[PDB]
Design a protein around this ligand. Structure first.
Ligand SMILES: Nc1nc2c(ncn2[C@@H]2O[C@H](COP(=O)(O)OP(=O)(O)CP(=O)(O)O)[C@@H](O)[C@H]2O)c(=O)[nH]1
Ligand SMILES: [Mg+2]
Length: 660
């Protein structure tokens, strides 16, 4: 175990679509892999430092896998496409880094492409992002003549012979560039002066400081979220990627340099878990992969203590033992088996049958802390799915079971009378990618209906009703007779059944049958056909025919009673109420407030984050369809939002008629 905590670097590459996120990653692994695919975490070496490239989801609108991966990584490279400029959503990726207090460096990719303006990037970081950038390098040559890069801090430059990254020469700075470099070098020192008194008192005195001095201060400013170093080049034309690697080991934080992850005890106490390898074990799980030839892989981040291969861990979320079989590190083109993962590092475990993405793993004798929050988010959006021709069906109902493992947060059901296949999840985007991950990945071709909000039904007042089923059906006679007392149950409390049968008035056998009929009618309410919730059912009386009584009779009899009940109890539709934090440029505040209220929303409060304003608001899910458009239409593309389920609500009286 050649593990040093200080010389460890956990990175994530964040970028707007088309910036060079994948290309840069590809090149990064290549240059590091020259001594003697994807996958959640990938490891490599540069200048005696371990770099763990935490794989961006990506696609930034799934704000569950983002918050999770932001806690896993420590520093980020934010990649900009310097061709088009800085487009709308490029802001969104920046706001995320701000949200999770993660130190960052910028990388202006595509200095080779026509339209490559370095400065358009720098200025838009100052203005829109509010990033206070510090210029670390300057280009040599324009677009297609882009052939060198100057490092202004050390005052040296690099010419590139080809575009394959196989000829790199350290040259003295061209005369045509020496003045501009000197300007920006002086500028750089000035920035360092804000973070070192020693640098300050030298910068006043006229004396040029040492590299160790500047590097240390410019690094201090980065980890403290005050400045953002900017680097450039062409990832495609293999220019400046090695210098980007150097920047990673220089200015980006090690696990020692950041604020300690906060977890919760089983009592609700808030603890700061310290990154000590000798202390108790606490580790997060964040990706469950299916691997062709090892089995299930579950990717972990270790925060304190040591995860040792071939041992046991305690799963605070599920409350059970788990056997850690083997441990692995993922490299560019091979797998490495390891004996232990210590505090601050990352890899993937083998085995771990019962663990799901988002769970915590402690060291058996260790404090029973939880890293994430407890509750399970509800299924709120329904989508109908119809398989083409038999062959796709049998491998669709197979495709879903063979996928309800890495993501158990989606539910599958069958619609009461249409007999289709209904899939439900956490929102639109959650489901719209599951559909795609079936036609391409699992190769199932079928038709998909337009997303629809999952409503619920319930009574407002207590009633007392009876259901009978006396008919001559299929040669024989049928008799079932039940008398129930139903009342409303506090919100979120669900179902409750009570038996209060006195004198074998309804014989022992037929009691399960009555329950089964109740449930089935509780699937399809008498307002819109959505499931009935939050009620207490009480079976107190009834009757039976000595010979005509049957399970089927008391099933239908129980069904007829509960439909009659939910009808008489002054029913009411329930809609999900979402919780929305909306990040917006300070200026366009009024025009977003004066829109959430038009969505029947209620404002909770606005507090600044960075140079922008985040708004917290309660809005119904039904008034959230295609918000990503309306938002970017009223913020010139600069706005962005997140969404979480909070509770269920009794719908306003005007909305009810519109739904019935
Ligand atoms: N001219 C030029 N083109 C580049 C450079 N780096 C990447 N590209 C090109 O731009 C495109 C961006 O794709 P990619 O590298 O996957 O970016 P990405 O952000 O991963 C796209 P997504 O976010 O959808 O996965 C690619 O087609 C790539 O060939 C560069 O340095 N210069
Ligand atoms: Mg990609």
């Amino acid at each position: 175990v050649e593990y040093d905590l200080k010389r460890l670097r956990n990175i994530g590459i964040a970028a707007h679509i088309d910036a060079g996120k994948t290309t840069t990653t590809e090149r990064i692994l290549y240059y590091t892999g020259r001594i003697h695919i994807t996958a959640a975490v990938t490891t490599c070496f540069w200048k005696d430092h371990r770099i763990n490239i935490i794989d961006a989801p990506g696609h930034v609108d799934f704000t569950i896998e983002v918050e999770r991966s932001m806690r896993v990584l420590d520093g980020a490279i934010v990649v900009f496409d310097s061709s088009q400029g800085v487009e709308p959503q490029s802001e969104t990726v920046w706001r995320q880094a701000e949200k999770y207090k993660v130190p960052r460096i910028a990388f202006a990719n595509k200095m080779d492409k026509t339209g490559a303006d370095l400065w358009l990037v720098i200025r838009t970081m100052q203005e829109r992002l509010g990033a206070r950038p510090v210029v670390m390098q300057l280009p040599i040559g324009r677009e297609d003549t882009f052939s060198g890069i100057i490092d202004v801090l050390r005052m040296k430059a690099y010419t590139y012979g080809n575009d394959l990254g196989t000829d790199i020469r350290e040259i003295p700075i061209p005369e045509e560039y020496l003045d501009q470099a000197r300007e920006y070098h002086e500028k750089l020192v000035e920035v360092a002066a804000d973070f070192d008194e020693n640098i300050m008192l030298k910068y006043l005195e006229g004396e040029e400081p040492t590299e160790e001095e500047l590097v240390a201060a410019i690094r201090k400013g980065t980890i403290d979220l005050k400045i953002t170093p900017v680097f450039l080049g062409s990832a495609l034309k293999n220019k400046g990627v090695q210098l980007l690697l150097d920047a990673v080991v220089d200015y980006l934080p090690s696990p020692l340099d950041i604020p300690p992850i906060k977890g919760t005890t089983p009592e609700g106490e808030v603890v700061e878990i310290h990154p000590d390898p000798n202390g108790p074990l606490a580790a997060l799980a964040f990706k469950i992969m299916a691997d062709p030839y090892v089995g299930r892989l579950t990717f972990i981040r270790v925060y304190s203590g040591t995860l040792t291969s071939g041992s046991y861990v305690y799963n605070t979320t599920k409350g059970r033992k788990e056997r850690v079989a083997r441990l692995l590190r993922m490299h560019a083109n091979h797998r490495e088996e390891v004996e232990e993962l210590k505090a601050g590092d990352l890899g993937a475990v083998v085995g771990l049958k019962e663990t799901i993405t988002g769970d915590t793993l402690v060291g058996e004798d260790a404090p029973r802390v939880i890293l994430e929050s407890i509750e399970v988010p509800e299924p709120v959006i329904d989508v109908a799915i119809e398989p083409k021709t038999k062959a796709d069906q049998e491998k669709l109902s197979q495709a879903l079971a063979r996928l309800a493992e890495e993501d158990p947060t989606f539910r599958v059901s069958t619609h009461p009378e249409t007999g289709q296949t209904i899939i439900s999840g956490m929102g639109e985007l959650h489901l719209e990618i599951i559909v795609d991950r079936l036609k391409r990945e699992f190769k199932v071709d079928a038709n998909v209906g337009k997303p629809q909000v999952a409503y619920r039904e319930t009574i407002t007042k207590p009633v007392d009703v009876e259901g009978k089923f006396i008919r001559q059906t299929g040669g024989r006679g049928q008799y079932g007779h039940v008398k129930i007392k139903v009342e409303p149950l506090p919100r979120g409390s669900g179902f409750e059944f009570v038996n209060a049968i006195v004198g074998g008035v309804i014989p022992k056998e037929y009691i399960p049958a009555v329950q089964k009929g109740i449930e089935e009618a509780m699937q399809s309410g008498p307002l819109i056909g959505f499931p009935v919730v939050d009620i207490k059912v009480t079976l107190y009386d009834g009757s039976y025919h000595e010979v005509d009584s049957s399970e089927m009779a008391f099933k239908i009899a129980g069904s007829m009673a509960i439909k009659e009940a939910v009808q008489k109890g002054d029913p009411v539709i329930l809609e999900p109420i979402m919780r929305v934090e909306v990040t917006t440029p300070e200026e366009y505040m009024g025009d977003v407030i004066g829109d959430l209220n038009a969505r029947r929303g209620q404002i909770l409060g606005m507090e600044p984050r960075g140079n922008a304003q985040v708004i917290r608001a309660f809005v119904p899910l039904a008034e959230m369809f295609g918000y990503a458009t309306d938002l970017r239409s009223k913020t010139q593309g600069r706005g962005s939002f997140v969404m979480f389920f909070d509770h269920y609500q009794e719908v306003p009286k005007q909305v009810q008629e519109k739904l019935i």
